[PDB]
Structure formats: structure tokens, C-alpha cells
């Protein structure tokens, strides 16, 4: 039976799915014109960049 230790495997899967999704959240343009900070400071001035 390959699904015998699913209770334990779910743990390491959720812990991975918790961080992996947390990495994709960096692509989320939260009310911003870009999700990369270096692109903002390079395209806008500090007053409008902040």
C-alpha cells in the first residue's frame, strides 16, 4: 500500500505548499505597477516610488 503514511506525508506537503505559495505571492502586484522593487526604484522617483 503506497498510501499508508499519508498522514505524515500530508504534513511535509502542506509545509511545502505553504512556502511555495508564499513565494508566488511576491509576484502579486499589491496596488503596485510592478512586483519587483528594483523595477520601481528604477522607473519612479522616491516620492512616487514610496
Amino acid at each position: 500500500t503506497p498510501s499508508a503514511l499519508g498522514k505524515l506525508q500530508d504534513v511535509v506537503n502542506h509545509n511545502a505548499q505553504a512556502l511555495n505559495t508564499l513565494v508566488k505571492q511576491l509576484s502579486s502586484k499589491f496596488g503596485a505597477i510592478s512586483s519587483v522593487l528594483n523595477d520601481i526604484l528604477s522607473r519612479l522617483d522616491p516620492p512616487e516610488a514610496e
Binding site: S42, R43, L44, D45
Partner: protein, 50 residues
């Protein structure tokens, strides 16, 4: 430095490529009461590519 532009309905698009544009050389022309940039600042142009 052109003599006569076109109408608002027949505006003439002037494609520009394979060059290096020093936008500072535009200010020395007629006054610019409005130099608004909606995606970037009017200063970060000489540091970015297009």
C-alpha cells in the same frame, strides 16, 4: 524643431529605434509647462532602456 505638425485626427507617429536618446536635450526647446509621465518619472529615462 518641425514647422507644422499634423491634425489631431491625422497625427503622425514617428517610430524611433536604434539610437540613444538624451531626454535632457528636449528641455532646451520651447517651454514645457506640462511634462507629466504616467508610468515613470521625467528623470529615470536616461537610466533605462526601451
Amino acid at each position: 524643431n518641425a514647422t507644422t505638425f499634423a491634425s489631431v485626427y491625422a497625427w503622425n507617429r514617428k517610430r524611433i529605434s536604434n539610437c540613444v536618446a538624451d531626454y535632457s536635450v528636449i528641455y532646451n526647446f520651447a517651454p514645457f509647462f506640462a511634462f507629466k509621465c504616467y508610468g515613470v518619472s521625467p528623470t529615470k529615462l536616461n537610466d533605462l532602456c526601451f
